[PDB]
Amino acid sequence: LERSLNRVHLLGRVGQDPVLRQVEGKNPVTIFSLATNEMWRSKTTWHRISVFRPGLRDVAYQYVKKGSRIYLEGKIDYGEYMDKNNVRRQATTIIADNIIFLSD
Amino acid sequence: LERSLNRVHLLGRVGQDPVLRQVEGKNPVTIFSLATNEMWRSDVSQKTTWHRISVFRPGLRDVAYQYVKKGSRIYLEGKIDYGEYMDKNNVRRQATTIIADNIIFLS
């Protein structure tokens, strides 16, 4: 039923120590934050990263640490929800599939 | 500073005709959406993600504008850019766009 590509490739500095959270009652995730730099002539982007994957999440919990440089691949998910039911807002996260640990 | 990456590779079908945006008295933007299908086994659960594609680059803005249509299959590469506006209190939101710098038309 025909295929697509959604893949973001990031390489940056992790900005917070990972957080363990729980999506719905039973979907564990560790979430952290990563900064990218727009090096332009003549300015930081902060990405929110979610690792839902059953082994890759435990590993990025003990090994991701603020100031670590990391290369990472995944999917964009815009995470749209209604706020206090009213305004439709979006909470976009990069859902990581691959984290190659650079320091250490 | 030291090199960072922010690249998005996307391939899919355009969801609407492009829209040029010169509202203010600024820099014009071609805007369209792109659908991407995520379908996963373990089971087969289908999911579609709609992405807001912006192209500012002088030239590719124009090509994107006359040539992409609703229906076109397309490959592009960009950067994720969040909305980043401090909406109320300072209680901000976003309105994230992929800003395209390369569009390959699959025909």
From Swiss-Prot, chain A:
Source taxonomy: Eukaryota, Metazoa, Chordata, Craniata, Vertebrata
Residue list for modification Phosphoserine: 42
Free-text function comment from the UniProt entry: Binds preferentially and cooperatively to pyrimidine rich single-stranded DNA (ss-DNA). In vitro, required to maintain the copy number of mitochondrial DNA (mtDNA) and plays a crucial role during mtDNA replication by stimulating the activity of the replisome components POLG and TWNK at the replication fork. Promotes the activity of the gamma complex polymerase POLG, largely by organizing the template DNA and eliminating secondary structures to favor ss-DNA conformations that facilitate POLG activity. In addition it is able to promote the 5'-3' unwinding activity of the mtDNA helicase TWNK.
Effect annotated for changing residue 13 to Q: In OPA13; may impair dimerization and tetramerization
One Gene Ontology cellular component: nucleus
First-listed, main subcellular location of the protein, grouped into a coarse class: mitochondrion
Full protein name: Single-stranded DNA-binding protein, mitochondrial
Record flagged with keyword Ligase: no
Modified residues (N6-succinyllysine): 84
GO BP term, example: mitochondrial genome maintenance
Subunit structure: Homotetramer. Interacts with MPG/AAG, through inhibition of its glycosylase activity it potentially prevents formation of DNA breaks in ssDNA, ensuring that base removal primarily occurs in dsDNA. Interacts with POLDIP2. Interacts with PRIMPOL.
Modified residues (N6-acetyllysine): 75
Organism of derivation: Homo sapiens (Human)
Disease: Optic atrophy 13 with retinal and foveal abnormalities: An autosomal dominant disease characterized by visual impairment in association with bilateral optic atrophy. Atrophy of the optic disk indicates a deficiency in the number of nerve fibers which arise in the retina and converge to form the optic disk, optic nerve, optic chiasm and optic tracts. Many OPA13 patients also exhibit retinal pigmentary defects, attenuated retinal vasculature, macular dystrophy, and foveopathy.
Domain of life from the UniProt record: Eukaryota
Gene: SSBP1
Keywords, comma-separated and alphabetical: Acetylation, Disease variant, DNA replication, DNA-binding, Mitochondrion, Mitochondrion nucleoid, Phosphoprotein, Transit peptide
Location(s) in or outside the cell: Mitochondrion; Mitochondrion matrix, Mitochondrion nucleoid
Effect upon mutating residue 15 to V: In OPA13; reduced ability to stimulate POLG-dependent DNA synthesis in vitro
Keyword Transit peptide attributed: yes
Curated annotation (Swiss-Prot), chain B:
Record-level GO BP terms: DNA replication; DNA-templated DNA replication; mitochondrial genome maintenance; positive regulation of helicase activity; positive regulation of mitochondrial DNA replication; protein homotetramerization
Tissue-wise expression: Expressed in retinal ganglion cells, photoreceptors, pigmented epithelium and fibroblasts (at protein level).
Subcellular location: Mitochondrion; Mitochondrion matrix, Mitochondrion nucleoid
Phosphoserine found at: 42, 45
Effect listed in the UniProt record for changing residue 15 to V: In OPA13; reduced ability to stimulate POLG-dependent DNA synthesis in vitro
Alphabetically ordered keywords of this record: Acetylation, Disease variant, DNA replication, DNA-binding, Mitochondrion, Mitochondrion nucleoid, Phosphoprotein, Transit peptide
UniProt entry tagged with the keyword DNA-binding: yes
Modified-residue entries (N6-succinyllysine), positions: 88
Gene Ontology CC: extracellular exosome; mitochondrial matrix; mitochondrial nucleoid; mitochondrion; nucleus
Impact after mutating residue 13 to Q: In OPA13; may impair dimerization and tetramerization
Residues with the N6-acetyllysine modification: 79
The SSB domain, residue ranges: 5-107
Effect of residue 73 to Q: In OPA13; reduced ability to stimulate POLG-dependent DNA synthesis in vitro
Function: Binds preferentially and cooperatively to pyrimidine rich single-stranded DNA (ss-DNA). In vitro, required to maintain the copy number of mitochondrial DNA (mtDNA) and plays a crucial role during mtDNA replication by stimulating the activity of the replisome components POLG and TWNK at the replication fork. Promotes the activity of the gamma complex polymerase POLG, largely by organizing the template DNA and eliminating secondary structures to favor ss-DNA conformations that facilitate POLG activity. In addition it is able to promote the 5'-3' unwinding activity of the mtDNA helicase TWNK.
Record note on quaternary structure: Homotetramer. Interacts with MPG/AAG, through inhibition of its glycosylase activity it potentially prevents formation of DNA breaks in ssDNA, ensuring that base removal primarily occurs in dsDNA. Interacts with POLDIP2. Interacts with PRIMPOL.
Disease named in the record: Optic atrophy 13 with retinal and foveal abnormalities: An autosomal dominant disease characterized by visual impairment in association with bilateral optic atrophy. Atrophy of the optic disk indicates a deficiency in the number of nerve fibers which arise in the retina and converge to form the optic disk, optic nerve, optic chiasm and optic tracts. Many OPA13 patients also exhibit retinal pigmentary defects, attenuated retinal vasculature, macular dystrophy, and foveopathy.
Protein name, as recorded: Single-stranded DNA-binding protein, mitochondrial
Gene from which the chain derives: SSBP1
Residues of the full protein shown: 26 to 141 of 148
